[PDB]
Amino acid sequence: MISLIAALAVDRVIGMENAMPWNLPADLAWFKRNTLNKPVIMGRHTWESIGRPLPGRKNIILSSQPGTDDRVTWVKSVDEAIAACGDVPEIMVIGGGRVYEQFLPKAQKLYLTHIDAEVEGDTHFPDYEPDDWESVFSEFHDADAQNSHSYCFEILERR
């Protein structure tokens, strides 16, 4: 099973200048809980944005060019990325925009954080078709001293 996990600001913005400008510790904790002990697939730009391997996960990087770091696994196509995960119950696709576009048609589950924040961005999560997806979990949180915007954790499953 393939799942996508992402955090979306207003208008589906996910990034600006190869960064995420907000800081929501509760959302990063959600990301870690839902990805730990699973393979994670990311594109090369997202690898550069994170800047280091994510511990406790098999890190798989898509790039058309040879890898430059043997602490992670480098692959050259979507099918190779999936194969490199092996026989696991759930593969997590962690972006960025181009990678999400390619994996969305193959995904059964979306883990989405909706952040109440207006962000100038240059990268968006794909337009997906709402009729294709059932919301099976949602949890709203107001802003607090650690998290400066309100946010909604949602899990959707392909109908």
Ligand X SMILES: NC(=O)c1ccc[n+]([C@@H]2O[C@H](COP(=O)([O-])OP(=O)(O)OC[C@H]3O[C@@H](n4cnc5c(N)ncnc54)[C@H](OP(=O)(O)O)[C@@H]3O)[C@@H](O)[C@H]2O)c1
Ligand Y SMILES: Nc1nc(=O)c2nc(CNc3ccc(C(=O)N[C@@H](CCC(=O)O)C(=O)O)cc3)cnc2[nH]1
Contacts 24+ apart (CB under 8 A), 66-73: 72/47
Segment 3 to 32, residues that bind ligand X, using CB under 6 A:
6-7, 14-15, 18-20
Tell me which stretch binds ligand X (CB under 6 A): 57-65, 82-90, 133-141, 147-155. Answer: 57-65
Work out which of 25, 33, 55, 65 binds ligand X, going by CB under 6 A: 65
CB of 116 to Mn ion, least distance (A): 4
Residue 106 binding Mn ion, by CB under 5 A: no
Contact partner at residue 115 from ligand Y, Mn ion, ligand X, none, CB < 5 to 8 Å by partner kind: none
Task: CB nearer to ligand Y: give 1 or 19.
Answer: 19
Mark 79-118 with x for binding to ligand X (rule: CB under 6 A) and - for no binding.
---------------xxxxxx--x----------------
How far, in Å, CA of 82 to CA of 39, rounded? 10
10 in Cβ contact with 119 (< 8 Å)? yes
- Count Cβ atoms below 10 Å from residue 8 Cβ, excluding itself: 20
24 in Cβ contact with 147 (< 8 Å)? yes
Work out which of 12, 38, 49, 57 binds ligand X, going by CB under 6 A: 49
Work out which of 26, 53, 63, 106 binds ligand X, going by CB under 6 A: 63
Q: Tokens at residue 23, please?
A: 């800081």
How far, in Å, CA of 136 to CA of 64, rounded? 36
Q: Would you say how long the chain is, in residues? A: 159
- First-to-last alpha carbon distance for the chain, in angstroms, is 14
Number of residues that bind Mn ion (CB under 5 A): 5
Q: Tokens at residue 49, please?
A: 């944005």
| Footprint of ligand X (CB under 6 A) | 6-7, 14-15, 18-20, 42-46, 49, 62-65, 76-78, 94-99, 102, 123
